[PDB]
Design a protein that fits this description.
This is part of a larger assembly, with 1 copy of chain A (186 residues), 10 copies of chain B and 1 copy of chain C (255 residues). Chain B is mainly alpha-helical and 51 residues long. Chain B is built from 2 helices and no strands. Chain C contains 11 helices and no strands. In chain C, helix 4 (54-67) packs antiparallel against helix 5 (78-89), helix 4 crosses helix 6 and helix 9 (186-192) packs across helix 10. Classes of the chains: A mainly alpha (186), B mainly alpha (51), C mainly alpha (255). Chain K: Belongs to the adenoviridae hexon protein family.
Chain lengths: 186, 51, 255, 303, 101, 97, 101, 101, 51, 51, 50, 51
């Protein structure tokens, strides 16, 4: 008549992968000196936090779990930035040719106007400051995305299924080089 | 932006960087670039008597 | 194959590609060869060297047991030399028929997987995804025209009515129903288009010497892909983005 | 010096360095052509003026490219005569009247005369967040000076449990305490030496005397420990001959077969397909300055 | 800042990939007089996938002679080399460790 | 012609300027700057201590041993605004050890 | 004065352009034993516009310390490296020019 | 010794409140979990049970790391951003960073 | 059976084109730490006509 | 120990086998054989007459 | 096989008898090319290479 | 205590697959052939010997 404790995930800050999953000790109510009335009250708020976690694990977006620790570029949150506009011709700059003409008339020049930052004619120029890189990021999740996906899973019956749906990802020594392939398994 | 640690050696890191880029045999008097060497026939001296 | 099969068997096949089936390209390669490379192809017309097909047949069924997950890939190391040492000893006609019947069940097991799934409808994509594999996938001076060119090339493979997209030995050809100069070499068109991705039309003393280095091979490829693109495609004010809106409007206007 | 320690007969016919000159700094010599060139480049007299150019060796601002803005760039210079100046004999330069002093300095930079509208495109590309400049220290090491007591042989180091991810490797020599300063203080009062500092210069010379070495993770699981080496528990470096039984002696020297491999495999990518003299050899390489040697002595004592 | 290995370029994308396309076209043009491309770190990673096993075996491998013969003119050495299952030997690393007076 | 018999041979070697290195690789080769054991899941996602004892020859005076650990010292630096600059110092694995 | 420049190949087209396309395919085949491609001059032209400014600008800058400090052990100096607009400096070109006795 | 490294394995860390730390002599601190401490030869004031802390100086430094890499607070919050610096001995001090003389 | 010039690779096919094409893609992968490489001969043949 | 006071330094340099070259370009680099200023003097084809 | 390169002080180039080279305040001494200086006349520290 | 190679070309770079192999090879004890003197005298007459 006791529900199970949910398995909490381990985020590795370098490489962004998940380093296994242990159960959530450190958030356990010590019921070991409660009578039959307080035990029903304690195991009700344990069945309340599992009911919240079963709602949250319904939306785990099931092709991130298929390529677990093997995420490619289109499955990752990228830093924002515009597309590629080509750089304009520096001959078409406002003071490039006229410095070659006014000086060759006999002048010596010194002085200039401050830039747009104060230190497609003009939208092509100002698109250089908010430009995306060439190849997007591969193989790593930010903790914004590791917390949005992958909630604390609940594992209602411990290890009483087929060995094909054995939860091999919960071990911290899990590399993505093995025979059976990952899927949505709680 | 210069945060300086004690576990780092910026002196020896420059000495291995210079042996990677350029040759160490030459003397470049601007950076006082002169290799500390010894005599190969003194440290590991070979007693052959005399002609 | 594992592979136990060599590639580029031209020293055995150049002489019955000239006599049988009359290849003009095999004649042009044969006259170019030196006298020592030439005499090692005239005997293979006369006598053909017989090759033992036993170790290629035994290794064909060890790879199937790996494919069915029956045994680990580290075990076809020791188990192959333990099965070859048995057929060298007990070699007979009853054994050489046992290898062929087991080998006949390998091809019949995968030909049923072709007709039932109907992957012959996707026979264009299999030759094409094999072509976009050994490519560098990162070009200098480009990379937004280069990624978008592959996506519009994968769109033409799926949306055009009849494209065969076969391949010869080294390269991959592509044949559409416009008679005459149907074929386009996709391999030598990507060596001509190696530098012409991020070229911008600024530095021209004379117009030309940018569009003239486009050979007659890769120009026909830019003609076949022109109707299946848009303006929400190749990045603007470049050289390839203004070809593809020039060749599009010489096809959309010539109707 | 005493007369009979060397003469034209000592170890005659033998290419053999003296047994007591081994742990003596060979760079404290007057054939040290660098120190002779660095001393004659200033002058010959005692009182000299100098006019020098020193670099910036900190790796983040070594070759940083700056964008427009007013910047603030301060730095502290040393005045310790033992540290700044190098002596051939390596005596105390603080004891005698050796003194350095600075009358004026100034910083020199070189502004590239780029076009004002070409710079206006290159500034915008470097103000971007995805074009941040990356730099790395070339050494990439963590200095740790564990102390060997005088006359001792075994030193245990202990690291508590850490990440050990993307760890690269180990490197070790010995350094004399008298020849190695303390840089973390503003001045070292126990630093009485002014020759070549092997902690700051390259100039290592105690790279021998390293009889054994053993790496062990959790007071268990020795590394590599998969029966990789000849003696699979520890990295045996020297084995003195008349104690060796079965091989274990490369190069006609004391260096062992298992440990000569992991130096050629680390430095020159060899070991599995046969050894040879490598093509590109650096100045601090292995096979450039590895010098074996041998001699014979008569038995002593009886007659 | 995280994932802390692709941000500081311990691993991940090479120097021609995580930059702006406008800047890569700049550092290739203005290269022979104003070098910029040495100011960007380029990673260089090991495979760590199917190149070295967990299974315990020796790197260097001593063998002793089976039976030897001594003549006035020559000395016979006779060895039995064993290359186990799933092992691999290049004989360029083979040499005799001969020893005597 | 009258050399003394029963003489014994003595070997040694002198190594200068080298700083003995032990690579943290599986086959001790240079397959990459980031080595293969550095991105191994056994060492990255777990914590291990280190006991590493040496054995040197006895000398007549105190001696440091200059132990170096190969780490990956890296910076980034952004300059988003005129008169604006910022860095981020971070090294793997010995972040403040 | 051009087109007398272009005929004598001070400027104009490169060596694999003004030659006929059959001759270039000859001197690339017969190259390992009979070299011809060093008998044809190849121009090398600076861009002349868009790289270097024309306006009066200092090329190499000296800057003296703002506020030094001198005591027994060290010697502080503090500089204001004032990189204005339209200017770029690599700190590899930076060095301290120390004069003393 | 002058360095303590305390490691804690993974835990839920929910509604953590803060830290507090001193030093205590081993002779002045009993083990209460036994019914009688045999190694407790002291009878003065116990700072582990009374208030009476007096070695709250001698700390000099404090560094906190999460999962061995992520610092706290690493958002460049402090002047010395990678570790809480407690004492700073003067004559080892340049840029201020000393309070109340 | 195969002729003497072709079997011992005095003349004929180059090492790119008599190997297995999965051995070529294997040897080009390693090339640094475990080089097979030079365990296969490559015929280098004079043109012998028209020169 | 008996060194003379009031010493004055003298510096010089020896250059052999070298012509002092001063290139005719903007930043004194080598961005081309036909330089920057080699094309800019030809503006309007006037003349110059230097000493 | 030259040996008299070390004996030049000054190189003053003037275009139309009015315009110096390189002009534009490029050098630390912009009007000419000051090749060698005696060190007693150097109090401002414009000497390379010691 | 020396290390001698194998210089026959079918073993010198052979990449050996698994299997048990027997590798027997003879060594010389001739002093004039093994050793090398400066003057080029007769060492098998002048007491030279190797074992």
């Amino acid at each position: 008549d006791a529900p199970v404790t949910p398995y909490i995930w381990q985020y590795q800050p370098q490489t962004g992968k998940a380093a296994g999953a242990r159960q959530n000790y450190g958030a356990v109510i010590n019921w070991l000196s409660a009578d039959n009335n307080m035990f029903h009250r304690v195991q009700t708020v344990n069945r309340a936090r599992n009911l919240i976690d079963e709602i949250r694990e319904e939306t785990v977006r099931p092709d991130l779990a298929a390529s677990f620790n093997d995420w490619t570029y289109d499955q990752l949150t990228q830093p924002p930035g515009t597309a590629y506009l080509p750089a304009p011709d520096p001959l078409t700059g406002p003071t490039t040719i006229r410095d070659k003409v006014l000086s060759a008339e006999g002048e010596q020049l010194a002085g200039s106007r401050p830039s747009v930052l104060h230190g497609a004619p003009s939208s092509k120029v100002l698109s250089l400051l908010s430009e995306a890189p060439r190849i997007p990021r591969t193989e790593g999740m930010t903790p914004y995305q590791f917390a949005n996906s992958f909630p604390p899973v609940v594992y209602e019956d411990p290890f009483s299924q087929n060995l094909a749906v054995f939860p091999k990802e919960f071990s911290p020594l899990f590399e993505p080089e093995n025979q059976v392939l990952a899927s949505s398994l709680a | 932006i210069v945060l300086d640690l004690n576990d780092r050696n910026s002196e020896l890191s420059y000495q291995y960087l210079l042996a990677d880029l350029t040759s160490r045999w030459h003397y470049f008097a601007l950076w006082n670039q002169a290799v500390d060497d010894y005599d190969h026939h003194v440290r590991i001296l070979e007693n052959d008597g005399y002609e | 194959d594992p592979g136990l099969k060599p590639s580029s068997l031209w020293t055995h096949k150049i002489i019955d590609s000239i006599i049988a089936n009359r290849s003009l390209s095999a004649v042009q390669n044969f006259r170019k060869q030196p006298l020592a490379n030439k005499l090692t192809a005239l005997e293979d017309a006369i006598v053909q060297p017989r090759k033992d097909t036993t170790p290629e047949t035994v290794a064909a069924i060890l790879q199937e047991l790996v494919a069915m997950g029956a045994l680990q890939p580290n075990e076809v190391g020791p188990m192959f030399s333990d099965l070859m040492i048995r057929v060298h000893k007990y070699n007979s006609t009853n054994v050489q028929n046992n290898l062929s019947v087991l080998l006949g069940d390998i091809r019949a097991a995968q030909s049923e997987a072709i007709r039932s799934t109907n992957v012959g409808e996707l026979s264009n994509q299999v030759v094409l995804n094999d072509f976009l594999s050994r490519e560098p996938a990162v070009v200098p001076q480009g990379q937004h025209n280069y990624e978008a060119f592959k996506q519009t090339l994968r769109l033409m493979v799926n949306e055009a009515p009849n494209v065969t997209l076969f391949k010869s030995g080294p390269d991959t050809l592509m044949q559409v129903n416009i008679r005459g100069v149907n074929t386009v070499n996709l391999n030598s068109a990507f060596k001509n288009l190696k530098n012409f991705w991020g070229v911008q039309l600024d530095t021209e003393i004379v117009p030309g010497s940018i569009s003239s280095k486009l050979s007659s091979n890769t120009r026909v490829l830019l003609l076949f892909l022109a109707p299946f693109t848009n303006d929400s495609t190749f990045t603007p004010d470049t050289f390839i983005s203004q070809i593809m809106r020039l060749y599009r409007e010489t096809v959309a206007a010539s109707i | 010096p005493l007369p009979n320690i060397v003469d034209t007969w000592t170890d005659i016919g033998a290419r053999w360095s003296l047994d007591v000159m081994d742990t003596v700094n060979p760079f404290n010599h007057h054939r040290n052509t660098g120190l002779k060139y660095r001393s004659q480049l200033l002058g010959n007299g005692r009182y000299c003026d100098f006019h020098i150019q020193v670099p910036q060796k900190f790796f983040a601002i070594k070759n940083l490219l700056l964008l427009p803005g007013t910047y603030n760039y301060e730095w502290y210079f040393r005045k310790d005569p033992n540290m700044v100046l190098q002596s051939t004999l390596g005596n105390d330069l603080r004891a005698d009247g050796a003194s350095i002093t600075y009358t004026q300095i100034n910083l020199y930079v070189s502004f590239f005369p780029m076009n004002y509208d070409t710079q206006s495109e290159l500034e915008l590309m470097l103000r971007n967040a995805t074009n941040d400049q990356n730099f790395s220290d070339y050494l990439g090491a963590v200095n740790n000076l564990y102390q060997i007591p005088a006359g001792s042989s075994t030193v245990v180091v202990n690291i508590p449990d850490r990440s050990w991810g993307a760890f690269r490797g180990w490197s070790f020599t010995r350094l004399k305490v008298s020849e190695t300063p303390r840089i973390g203080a503003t001045q070292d009062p126990n630093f009485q030496y002014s020759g070549s500092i092997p902690y700051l210069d390259g100039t290592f010379y105690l790279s021998h005397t390293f009889q054994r070495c053993s790496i062990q993770w959790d007071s268990s699981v020795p590394w590599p420990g998969n029966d990789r080496m000849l003696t699979p528990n520890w990295f045996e470096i020297k084995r003195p001959i008349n104690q060796d039984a079965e091989g274990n002696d490369t190069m006609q020297s004391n260096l062992t077969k298992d440990f000569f491999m992991v130096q050629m495999a680390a430095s020159y990518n060899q070991g599995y397909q046969g050894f040879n003299w490598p093509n590109c050899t650096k100045h601090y390489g292995f096979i450039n300055n590895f010098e074996p040697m041998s001699r014979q002595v008569p038995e002593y004592g009886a007659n | 800042m995280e994932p802390q290995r692709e941000f500081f370029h311990i691993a991940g994308r090479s120097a021609k990939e995580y930059l702006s396309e406008n800047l890569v076209q700049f550092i290739q043009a203005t290269q022979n007089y104003f070098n910029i491309g040495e100011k960007f770190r380029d990673p260089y990673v090991a495979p760590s996938a199917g190149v070295t096993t967990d299974r315990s075996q020796k790197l260097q491998l001593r063998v002793v002679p089976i039976q030897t013969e001594d003549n006035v003119n020559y000395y016979k050495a006779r060895f039995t080399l064993n290359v186990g299952d799933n092992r691999l030997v290049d004989l360029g690393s083979s040499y005799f460790d001969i020893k005597g007076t | 012609r009258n050399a003394v018999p029963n003489q014994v041979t003595e070997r040694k070697f002198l190594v200068d300027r080298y700083l003995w290195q032990i690579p943290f690789s599986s086959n001790f080769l240079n397959m990459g700057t980031l080595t293969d054991l550095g991105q191994n899941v056994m060492y990255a996602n777990s914590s291990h201590s280190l006991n590493m004892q040496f054995t040197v020859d006895p000398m007549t005076e105190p001696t440091y041993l200059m132990l170096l650990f190969g780490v990956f010292d890296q910076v980034v630096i952004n300059q988003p605004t005129r008169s604006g600059i910022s860095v981020a110092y971070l090294r793997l694995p010995f972040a403040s050890g």
